[PDB]
């Protein structure tokens, strides 16, 4: 099925599948058992920011997840993203719950990709609306009317629903790498919430880059973060 | 001595000093003796493109030199720029000749750095005006009216001079990093034209970052590319 590259904000330590025994940031190529990991003191009911970064020069997919007080987790992975990505992708946000539950609200998301000024796409959402008729919603993901994108389902009380999955995908396909392009970079920034009354939050939010017709692979909830079919 | 961090377009293999035995591109930290270099198929009198990129996350300063045919040279180097230079710098272009000579012509030059809720300087010159009131030209540097930046001396007939040093710094000091800053990233790009009618062109162009009052360290023509006092 899908070719997937992601950055997991993995809030539940699903250890029988590879995850570290704490909440982590990860870089996920073609599989949820990340190819790198780093420890992420995972705050609750607080709004945080993730910055994801990459350039076809240094070939280092990098990410930071931070919260207002200063607590920051960093993770990084060397990789020639092309060999793994097709000339054309769509990029999107994904989150899930299952069984154990957490609000997966996106307050903002912006993204830039650049191919060398030659070719560039830049978008920013600082408020989600209505019908955001330039997102391709999938699963439980819904926007507004508090200006926000609930990636996963939430009761009108504010209660996050277990076994929920969701996706937001930028409508236009992103020219992520052209072969002859000396430089092919991209960055993406989104702000999160993750409020969970439960013992542990689960499952997380993930930015991902997939093929143009990517859909929520069947039965990827909880720890599969809506990105992957099985746990390979 | 100036805190100097640079990306060299070293046309001349000054060998009794460290340069590899061919024209090269490299990242110099506090020394004209590149922390790492790469071979560079310098094309005489063709219009080239430099990109410098850095992200405080992946900690990788990276550079690409390119020509319109496809001939493209890359270099990368891991470094926390927190550690090398101050909160505040000035950025600039530099070039030089010696007894060997070449044109050090800058067609365009653009620069972005972004901190972090976000702090950001972006500037771009595609056309240098003869009274370039926001560049701090130094030494043999002059602009326009050929909508260009001449970093080293050019006789009224396009003819490079020997023993010539020129520098172009952006007027404002760049906040290149603050410690609260989750992301401290920059990039620069220039497009240049280096021609020569001696046996070999010399000596090169460079993008550099130094402290806020950086003057051309004395006697740094030819192989020191106006960045370093001597050859340590």
């Amino acid at each position: 099925a899908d070719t997937i590259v992601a950055v997991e904000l993995d809030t539940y330590p699903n250890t029988d599948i590879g995850d570290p025994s704490y909440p982590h940031i990860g870089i996920d190529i073609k599989s949820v058992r990340s190819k790198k990991t780093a420890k992420w003191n995972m705050q609750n009911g607080k709004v945080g920011t993730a910055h994801i970064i990459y350039n076809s020069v240094g070939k280092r997919l990098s990410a930071v997840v931070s919260y207002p007080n200063g607590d920051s987790a960093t993770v990084s992975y060397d990789v020639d993203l092309d060999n793994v990505l097709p000339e054309w992708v769509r990029v999107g946000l994904s989150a899930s719950t299952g069984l154990y539950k957490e609000t997966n609200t996106i307050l903002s998301w912006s993204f830039t990709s650049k191919l060398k000024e030659t070719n560039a796409l830049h978008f920013v959402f600082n408020q989600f609306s209505k019908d955001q008729k330039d997102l391709i919603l999938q699963g439980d993901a819904t926007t507004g009317t508090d200006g926000n994108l609930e990636l996963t389902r939430v009761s009108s009380n504010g209660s996050p629903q277990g076994s929920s999955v969701g996706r937001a995908l930028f409508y236009a396909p992103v020219h992520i790498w052209e072969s002859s392009a000396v430089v092919a970079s991209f960055d993406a920034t989104f702000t999160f919430l993750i409020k969970s009354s439960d013992s542990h939050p689960a499952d997380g939010i993930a930015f991902f880059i997939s093929n143009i017709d990517s859909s929520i692979p069947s039965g990827s909830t909880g720890r599969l973060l809506g990105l992957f079919p099985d746990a390979n």
Side-chain angles (χ1 to χ4, degrees), chain A residues 1-116 118-191 193-232:
Chain A
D2 300 350
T3 280
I4 301 224
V5 169
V7 165
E8 81 186 25
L9 281 73
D10 195 329
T11 74
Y12 186 71
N14 330 98
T15 97
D16 104 45
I17 62 163
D19 270 338
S21 52
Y22 40 76
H24 54 296
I25 18 67
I27 281 140
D28 299 340
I29 298 201
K30 282 171 135 160
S31 204
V32 321
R33 31 191 49 143
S34 331
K35 300 237 138 121
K36 169 47 77 293
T37 33
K39 177 185 229 190
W40 170 44
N41 50 90
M42 195 288 312
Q43 271 265 282
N44 185 200
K46 308 286 169 35
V47 143
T49 320
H51 295 262
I52 292 140
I53 311 296
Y54 175 93
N55 59 163
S56 81
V57 193
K59 307 198 196 316
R60 214 219 271 300
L61 194 38
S62 308
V64 222
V65 178
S66 94
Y67 294 106
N69 55 233
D71 262 12
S72 218
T74 297
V75 77
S76 311
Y77 186 74
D78 291 357
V79 62
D80 171 294
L81 275 191
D82 4 303
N83 295 348
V84 325
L85 285 163
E87 184 163 318
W88 287 90
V89 305
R90 277 191 153 93
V91 301
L93 291 179
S94 195
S96 71
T97 46
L99 330 63
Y100 249 47
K101 23 201 155 45
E102 86 194 22
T103 70
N104 295 119
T105 4
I106 306 297
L107 273 42
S108 70
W109 171 39
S110 83
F111 169 95
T112 326
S113 99
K114 283 184 160 184
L115 280 180
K116 317 199 194 181
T118 316
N119 281 19
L121 165 68
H122 185 71
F123 65 80
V124 32
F125 305 99
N126 291 306
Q127 72 118 30
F128 306 85
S129 279
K130 57 142 173 291
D131 104 51
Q132 206 77 59
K133 260 288 95 238
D134 71 351
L135 277 174
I136 303 167
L137 294 204
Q138 301 171 355
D140 289 12
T142 33
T143 68
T145 77
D146 37 334
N148 286 348
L149 168 74
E150 300 299 356
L151 269 161
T152 56
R153 183 189 46 235
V154 237
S155 93
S156 36
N157 176 83
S159 305
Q161 299 297 320
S163 288
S164 170
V165 192
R167 287 165 154 212
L169 265 78
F170 193 76
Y171 203 77
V174 178
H175 211 153
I176 205 76
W177 78 263
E178 213 307 312
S179 180
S180 68
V182 289
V183 209
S185 62
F186 67 84
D187 92 280
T189 297
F190 67 99
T191 50
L193 201 10
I194 310 156
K195 221 188 147 66
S196 173
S197 41
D198 304 341
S199 307
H200 296 279
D203 283 74
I205 311 169
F207 174 83
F208 66 94
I209 297 173
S210 73
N211 57 99
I212 89 149
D213 63 317
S214 182
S215 45
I216 315 176
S218 321
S220 54
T221 151
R223 61 189 187 183
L224 272 174
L225 301 162
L227 328 152
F228 300 102
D230 45 49
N232 292 177

